[PDB]
Amino acid sequence: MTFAHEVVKSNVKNQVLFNGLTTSKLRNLMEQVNRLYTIAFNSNEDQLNEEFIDELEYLKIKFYYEAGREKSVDEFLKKTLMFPIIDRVIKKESKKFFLDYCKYFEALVAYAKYYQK
Amino acid sequence: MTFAHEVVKSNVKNQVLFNGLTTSKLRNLMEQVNRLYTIAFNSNEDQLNEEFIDELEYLKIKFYYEAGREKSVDEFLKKTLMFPIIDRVIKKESKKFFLDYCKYFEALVAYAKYYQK
Amino acid sequence: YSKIKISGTIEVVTGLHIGGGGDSPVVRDLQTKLPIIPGSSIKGKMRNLLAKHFGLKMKQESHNQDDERVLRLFGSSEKGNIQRARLQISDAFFSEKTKEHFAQNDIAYTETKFENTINRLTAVANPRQIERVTRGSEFDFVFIYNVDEESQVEDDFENIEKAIHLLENDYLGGGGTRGNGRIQFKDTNIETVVGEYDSTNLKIK
Amino acid sequence: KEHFAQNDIAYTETKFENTINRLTAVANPRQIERVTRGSEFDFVFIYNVDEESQVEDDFENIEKAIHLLENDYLGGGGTRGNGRIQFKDTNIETVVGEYDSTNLKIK
Amino acid sequence: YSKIKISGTIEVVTGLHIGGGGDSPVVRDLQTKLPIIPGSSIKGKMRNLLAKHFGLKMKQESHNQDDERVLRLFGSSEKGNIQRARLQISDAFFSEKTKEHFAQNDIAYTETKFENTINRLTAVANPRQIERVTRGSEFDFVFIYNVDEESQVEDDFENIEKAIHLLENDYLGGGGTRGNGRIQFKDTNIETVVGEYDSTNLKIK
Amino acid sequence: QDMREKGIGSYVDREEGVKRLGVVRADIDNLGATFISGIPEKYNSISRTATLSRQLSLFFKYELNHLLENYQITAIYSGGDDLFLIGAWDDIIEASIYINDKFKEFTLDKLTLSAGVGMFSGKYPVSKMAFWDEFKKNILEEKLLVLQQGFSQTDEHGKAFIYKMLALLRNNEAINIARLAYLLARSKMNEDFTSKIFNWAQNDKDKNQLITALEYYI
RNA sequence: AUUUAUAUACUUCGGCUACGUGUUC
RNA sequence: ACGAGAACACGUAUGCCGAAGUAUAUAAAU
Ligand SMILES: Nc1ncnc2c1ncn2[C@@H]1O[C@H](COP(=O)(O)OP(=O)(O)OP(=O)(O)O)[C@@H](O)[C@H]1O
């Protein structure tokens, strides 16, 4: 959807990335999404498991906590709108859309990785 | 179109290949294109599938990320202009032209393979 | 004069690789871009196994002559006492129900499992990738049997049952000794499509 | 022709085959050319009624012949799995004379 | 003529990484999406080990031609000779008891151990994610023994049981030198599936 | 080994190529003037016309017999201005070229030959069986020799590979050319052979010569 | 709590439609 | 009352045979 690419280009300010965000600040983040990526890729049906719903809730927990730690993490998590998309994934109970979100976050990660000091 | 052959000959500098590029640096690359090659060769109509559009987007993801990792990969991906041709393929939604791009990249791979230390 | 039709489905127990195109692709219908099981392959394996079951001698190895029953069922028309074939094998096509299943569950029609080669005294590896129809897929086949004579029918169907039973414990395609290409038969139907001969007493497992 | 041109399909396939030498088990290859599956051919039959009292029997016989042909093969290697055909879109039209050809059937 | 069925289960004692398809995943089916042991790997391991356990010359090492019993048991047929493999080694499938065990114990079907690359005198680390089949997994396997000559069944099964033993004391798969790939064989059953050969006095450990 | 005359199968049963037959017909194109016009205005005597006629007769009635001695071919109609030879496909072509050159020597490159050679299956009614420098230098000598050396040095490439070559070459489309580029990349010949073949295929005249030569190969 | 993110080698090698048979009574 | 009339380029046989997705480099420093 590459709107992530557009926002990342809009976030290279005069240089800094998201005003002090580094890819290693994202460690716990992509680790959680990849762990969920595995547990979901194992599943068969698109109808999500309900401990999987619990795991998505726990992921939102990690989001709110990372945002609490750092201001740059807060800015990143707010502008690029992780938060409504997680909410709608929780509301939808669809696996394929979960992987769509996964590729979304991975796109953010890769593009930022190439877009650095 | 063999302009790939011309650029590869222009890229044998005094010897090195693309200033430190090796065919095994291309592993993930040709693996992705071949995987897409299979999924597309299975299709019937030339009008591309839209998860196929998503897959092309994911391929562009792999492109920037590989470019981010290595400088030689960046030089290769920039000069030989993978990037506009992927953009126009995404814009065109045509299968036969997708296979045309596929044999393009395979031509690059083979010629480079014969064009080595 | 009558004809007996045999219908059924062939399920791939493991990866089947006919692959007559030679990378190393598989034969495909050019109307639907699908992998197929050519009938002549099935009939050749039935021939070979059934001949090996009965007498197969050195002098018999020489000429591709074989036991009178096998020749009778599959036809020779090569020297002297020629016998027109009584049994006609047809090709197998990738069925519609498996179309529906692989479409609904988004399952690829052909894996590309890589293999290697460790030669000795160098231990240097050499890679390759081959294509094989995915597990569990089914193909539909049809047989037609001619009755040029009345009394022999029971014996010919006994031999057919034996041939099928042997073939179920063997392989089609290639690399069979290496794991590929095991099948099993199921959902068989026997009906007299033309003529006036009953077939309610005839069974092939 | 229109369908295959639209879908970019070759008119004629080429299947590869072999044969196994007994006591030797070395395969010698084989190449055969085969008309693509699903093609349609156009056919015309002309029947000349010279005896009135025979047309029903003759058409019954020709239906039987079509029936057997549908359950058999044309061309070569029929026992090997090729040549099976099918008949569709058959009409019966009288074109010379005044014989009704609406009660005659061929399936 | 007859066929003999060798059936059993393989359990997995340490990690298993066949990785034929390759962060670097393992070979997995696409009908049900569980990992499998390709029969090609089984055959390669068995052939190489049983061949090396008897003689192996450098000229023997040259071009994959080995002593007469392996060339009989597994088949070569290139050196102007007639010989087909007398074992049909198939693929291995992650059995149903394992399905239910891990499903009702909520234990994953595969771990993911992380690796590192500590460079000498540089102490800079290079990460690595790798995936492996978990411990305690069990697969089911089948071997089919064709009986070509009556008088060599006993000796061939002695060689087969030696192969199984030596494999039990060796690894399977990839990276075996770093501690993943140990297997063990149990629950072997021998049955005659086609014919009139007796399978009573015959045992495999 | 048998002095008795044999049938048409004695030439059909050659295993060095397809079991077929070759036939050649030749007429002196510039013959009507030669007997009529002759040598103009100074040597159109009855004596010199007689000499010309007899020399042509001797060539078309003796030299052919000695020339044919190294070919699996049988002389049928010879004499006048008509030459009819029948035999193996390769031998017919080689003898046609060789006799063309020898005739160009005998007439000192003053008279030329018009000829046509076809291929037909064995025991076809011989009645209906019957009803230059570029071909030698470029096709038979250069491209044919290149292809023969390449196919002899690299194995596994039989009529199937050459027939795929033919399918790509006969249908003159750029897609076939790219496919042929990939096919030559996959082929296991010396890179010189592959480069020369591809560049021949890229020229219309050179692609036609190449297809002719490789068709001759089979 | 702070940097990597799979890395270089090999991406199918060997060995290339035979017989009844063409035509007439 | 057409150099016409009868007449299945047809019958037997496969893509097989052998090959392990391998072989190296500790999730570390303050
Ligand atoms: N040795 C010879 N001496 C005298 N006359 C000859 C001789 N050989 C052939 N001729 C005559 O020369 C004539 C050539 O006419 P013909 O139509 O056969 O060939 P042509 O006119 O050269 O044909 P084209 O020009 O199409 O090649 C013949 O009528 C023939 O009688």
UniProtKB/TrEMBL annotation, chains A, B:
InterPro entries xref list: CRISPR-assoc_prot_Csm2_III-A
A Pfam family recorded for this sequence: Csm2_III-A
Endpoints of the signal sequence: none
A biological process term (GO) from this entry: defense response to virus
Function: This subunit may be involved in monitoring complementarity of crRNA and target RNA.
Assigned keywords, A-Z: Antiviral defense, RNA-binding
Protein family per UniProt: Belongs to the CRISPR-associated Csm2 family.
Organism of this sequence: Staphylococcus epidermidis (strain ATCC 35984 / DSM 28319 / BCRC 17069 / CCUG 31568 / BM 3577 / RP62A)
UniProt-recorded name of the protein: CRISPR system Cms protein Csm2
An annotated Gene Ontology molecular function: RNA binding
Automatic annotation (TrEMBL), chains C, E:
A Pfam family it matches: RAMPs
GO biological process, one term: defense response to virus
Positions contributing to Ca(2+) 1 binding: 169
InterPro entries found in the cross-reference section: CRISPR-assoc_RAMP_Csm3, CRISPR_Csm3_endoribonuclease, RAMP_III_fam
GO MF: endonuclease activity; hydrolase activity; metal ion binding; RNA binding
The keyword Hydrolase appears for this protein: yes
Protein keywords: Antiviral defense, Calcium, Endonuclease, Hydrolase, Metal-binding, Nuclease, RNA-binding
Chain positions recorded as Ca(2+) 2 binding sites: 190
PANTHER family named among the record's database cross-references: CRISPR SYSTEM CMS ENDORIBONUCLEASE CSM3 (PTHR35579)
Family: Belongs to the CRISPR-associated Csm3 family.
Name by which UniProt lists this protein: CRISPR system Cms endoribonuclease Csm3
Lineage: Bacteria, Bacillati, Bacillota, Bacilli, Bacillales
Domain of life: Bacteria
Domain CRISPR type III-associated protein: 9-183
CDD domains according to UniProt: Csm3_III-A (cd09684)
TrEMBL record, chain F:
Listed transmembrane segments: none
Positions bound to ATP 3: 32, 53
Chain residues that bind ATP 1: 77
Family: Belongs to the CRISPR-associated Cas10/Csm1 family.
Residue ranges occupied by any GGDEF domain in the UniProt entry: 19-131
Parent-protein residues present: 506 to 750 of 757
Binding site residues for ATP 2: 53
UniProt name for this protein: CRISPR system single-strand-specific deoxyribonuclease Cas10/Csm1 (subtype III-A)
Organism: Staphylococcus epidermidis (strain ATCC 35984 / DSM 28319 / BCRC 17069 / CCUG 31568 / BM 3577 / RP62A)
Signal peptide: none
